[PDB]
Amino acid sequence: EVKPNPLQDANLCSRVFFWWLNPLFKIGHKRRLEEDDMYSVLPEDRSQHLGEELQGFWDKEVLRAENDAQKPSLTRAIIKCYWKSYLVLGIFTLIEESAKVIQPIFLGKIINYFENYDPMDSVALNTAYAYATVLTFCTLILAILHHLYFYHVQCAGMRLRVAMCHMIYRKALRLSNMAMGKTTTGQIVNLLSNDVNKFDQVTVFLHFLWAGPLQAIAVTALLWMEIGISCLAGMAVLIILLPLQSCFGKLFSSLRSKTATFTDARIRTMNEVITGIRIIKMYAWEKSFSNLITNLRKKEISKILRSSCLRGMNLASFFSASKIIVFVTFTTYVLLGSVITASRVFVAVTLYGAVRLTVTLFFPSAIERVSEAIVSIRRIQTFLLLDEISKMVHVQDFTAFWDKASETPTLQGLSFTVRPGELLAVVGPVGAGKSSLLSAVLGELAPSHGLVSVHGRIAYVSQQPWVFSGTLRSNILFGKKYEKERYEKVIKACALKKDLQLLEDGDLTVIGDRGTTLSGGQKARVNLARAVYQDADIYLLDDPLSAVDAEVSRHLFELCICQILHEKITILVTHQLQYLKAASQILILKDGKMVQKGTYTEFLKSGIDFGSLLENRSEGKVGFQAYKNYFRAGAHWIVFIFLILLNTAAQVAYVLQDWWLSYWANKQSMLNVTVNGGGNVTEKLDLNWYLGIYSGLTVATVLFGIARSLLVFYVLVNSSQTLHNKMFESILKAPVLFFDRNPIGRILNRFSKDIGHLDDLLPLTFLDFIQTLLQVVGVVSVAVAVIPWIAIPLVPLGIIFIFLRRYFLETSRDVKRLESTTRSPVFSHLSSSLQGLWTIRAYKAEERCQELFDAHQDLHSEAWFLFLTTSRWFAVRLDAICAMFVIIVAFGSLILAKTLDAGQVGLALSYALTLMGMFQWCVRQSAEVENMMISVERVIEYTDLEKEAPWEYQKRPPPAWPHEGVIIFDNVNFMYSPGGPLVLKHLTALIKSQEKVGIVGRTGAGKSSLISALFRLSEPEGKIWIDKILTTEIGLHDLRKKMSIIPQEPVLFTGTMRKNLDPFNEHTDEELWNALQEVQLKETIEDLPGKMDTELAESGSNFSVGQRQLVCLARAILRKNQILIIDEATANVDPRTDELIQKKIREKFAHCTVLTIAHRLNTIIDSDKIMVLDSGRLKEYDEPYVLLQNKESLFYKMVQQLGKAEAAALTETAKQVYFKRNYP
């Protein structure tokens, strides 16, 4: 019982006020919260019991539905299981709705007291005090019960999600062969990522579904009995607000998809240009790339601006709907010929605002959440309805089918009998049927016809390794007893001493899955150890030495097989004669059947030959520099001043609307009391003038809101576009060191996540936070204007709020980080367990994996529950502060009743009763903005990235230079970092004139050094001369574009063949035709009609290495180059095309300087001079005579180590080329 759980012995007062989160917050504020400081879940929150009971209900419902010939459902089971928990919360929901509906009644009863107020009447004062006390009490119980019910619903949804994921895992752990072949890991991944997550959100409004219409009808009847028939216009407007918002959301989703497809295209293009950034940087093709990038960016930003304007119009309509409804209803009421009373007006506006908020917040969210939950439940149901699964070996023609589509038998002839001590070898080509046997013996294969007889425990060894998360010792011993001799034999017999002397703490270390720290060799070692640790009788393994060195695998065989498995039943699958020495029996598979079984001797003497067969985020608040840069990048100071003035004018108009409304109410009350208070002459107030002023103020505030929203959206979109353009221009001119240090995945993440955030979530959240803050500021200003005494308690309340917000965020950040870092291991372990379902079903040890998944889900639910409790405590505190402020305002207004009219107190109370919920929404929006500002910070930091030398200086190069292309070596080297490593030193030689020259280099001892020094991507150490002219005057484009690239990554470009060969196509088509007919390129493209503008894909979907190298040589000869480089061309090439392109490049490029890099030793013979590089130093750069005459040179030893026949061939070719070169 480690990590005891709080709130288990707490009373009702501490549970209803969340007073048990004091020690956790006190620990999280002083230091960092780890995984050991968390609080365990409740006993009823365990995954095991919930999963078991929900699975029981599911199977009971399935049986009840199948017994009566109907299809089973899971929603009915969920209802029958959680109705006891839902009906209890329904009563609290109904009580809360009734309280929220009756609150405006007491509000109006309080406001009506000031109309007929009498300072000499005690009954009215007592009634007003009682009504104020009742209002305070109902507000308090509302603010409490709302968060209580929210926390209860969140806990119920979390438990439901845990139970559902447990059932899904339990059902996936029992899948059959067809189910395993019909489902992919990513399917279960997105299932457990979306379906169980929607359950935590659908339950929030599952009760609002029915709470909506009842509250709406109640408020409608109240407004009716209050004012009359003038509610019809408001109800009609509220009704027609739904289809307009529906079409607006549909158009917004369409525009969002239209921008998302372009965003995906741009992300793919960016990844393609970044993964091969050296290719574009050398060819100087940045111009056309930037052109197409800005073209796609504009094509996307058009729809982005359209969607932003649509969202701004929708937000302005949602914000002004309350004012429009109020104005329309009041115009309809005045047109009837009645009087205006402050209490009824305030009740009407409050009820209308509440109904609008409800209808436009809960109802559509409820509908969409219920639809998503129903879809998820149906998906889970159709996923769970799949087909589940049901001392010597001896079989009699067990004929089973693996491909049920074709009823033909796939493999026959099963007759095997082995004795204790035999070693059996299996050899076969691809698709021979070894996996069929390994699955039939283990029972994975469905029995159709035959016999399967095995005795004792049996284990399975997959061809690919498998492991779960945790330690290494218990991983190897698999939860069994840590026995001495067994474990010691396995560890000394698995070549683990080197691993342990390279490991941290032996087998007691925490090692993750997915190979984050373990290579293939040691992984095969540990899986072989976990397989042979059980010491079963029959052992079936499938080549566990595929990813390990040969001699060590043979040694491991000699230590394991004849020592531990020498008395066990072993049927091994071999590859070739390297493992046919200790094998007593051998079985071969030919087109699904065998011919005979016997000793390796009987099979060898028969004449059978197998040759035909063969991260440091800124902790705290973001600095103001990022905000200033983000505001100045897309807008100027005048634009910001205009936006601030527009927002201020909009807020002022929104305030003066209600101000003039209350003023007109007070004027009408005064007119009534003067015409009824002993007055004969009547003066009816001019209704047209007041109606005109009201309509003018309404249209003014509506236009102001629309304009400020449009301006905010435009400014934010322009700022995002400018930031993206600046980042692109800074990365395009950045050196290759930035791409070498930061991997491609980091750049992809920074280009995807930050861009998507700034495009979708930043503008809407920012404008919502700004609008809510402006509303709160206006409410506070109205409160201080009505009562000047509210400004006194504003300082302590504000200080307490700021301190509480900081104290809560300091812990919420760490809690969210822990939740994010604990959510992914669950899915990782799920994928790892699903990848090795064969070994799990074979070992019959599903209980261990089930318990591991249950513990992972328990930890995840624990972190989620801690986060929910922290958020609920913060919300309770915020609502309590707001309620206390409302109580203080109401008391201060009721005390000074002699100097306050009815309209003033009514407006003050109506404005104070709107802070509840709105305040916490503003706080959460500010928190989300501060959390998302890290993307803007990273974008600005990437924009402020240092640039290298300019592309071209003021000195224009001549149209003939370079003419010769002579390079002079004068102490030139390369630097990987300023003041870092250095291998090359004192490199000096002399090159020939327009004739072949060669550079030799061995693997691992200067390869990367030579590629860096010869290509010269980064600024190298030393002074470089091209034809004895200084190099520090022009960038990389005009100088390092004359080389031909022969890397492991061929020419990959998407689009028309023009942009692939020459994106600027300065020359006409005739020379291009001639060059492609010279390089034999047309005969391959004759197939498709896209001779010139065909669509090509990346990563070589339909392209081979051959035609790619051919078109590369074609582009090289099109560039009209005088320097040519070839290296490491014998990696992924076919011999035919290899010799073809070799002969072609030999006969063609024979008129100028050819800088051939010598990776092999046969292609260098056609050169003239070679300098031998060793440890970053050359010996001599002369003809091969000095290296073939002197015997102590290293060239001689390479000649021997490359083979005697190859030695004779190379020396023969050398003598030949020397004889044709000296005396022609």
Ligand SMILES: CCCCC[C@H](O)/C=C\[C@H]1[C@H](O)CC(=O)[C@@H]1CCCCCCC(=O)O
């Ligand atoms: C009087 C309402 C009490 C609850 C808080 C409510 O959210 C009010 C605030 C509005 C804000 O003024 C505009 C807006 O969008 C808020 C509502 C947004 C959604 C609130 C529910 C939570 C959710 O949507 O996940």
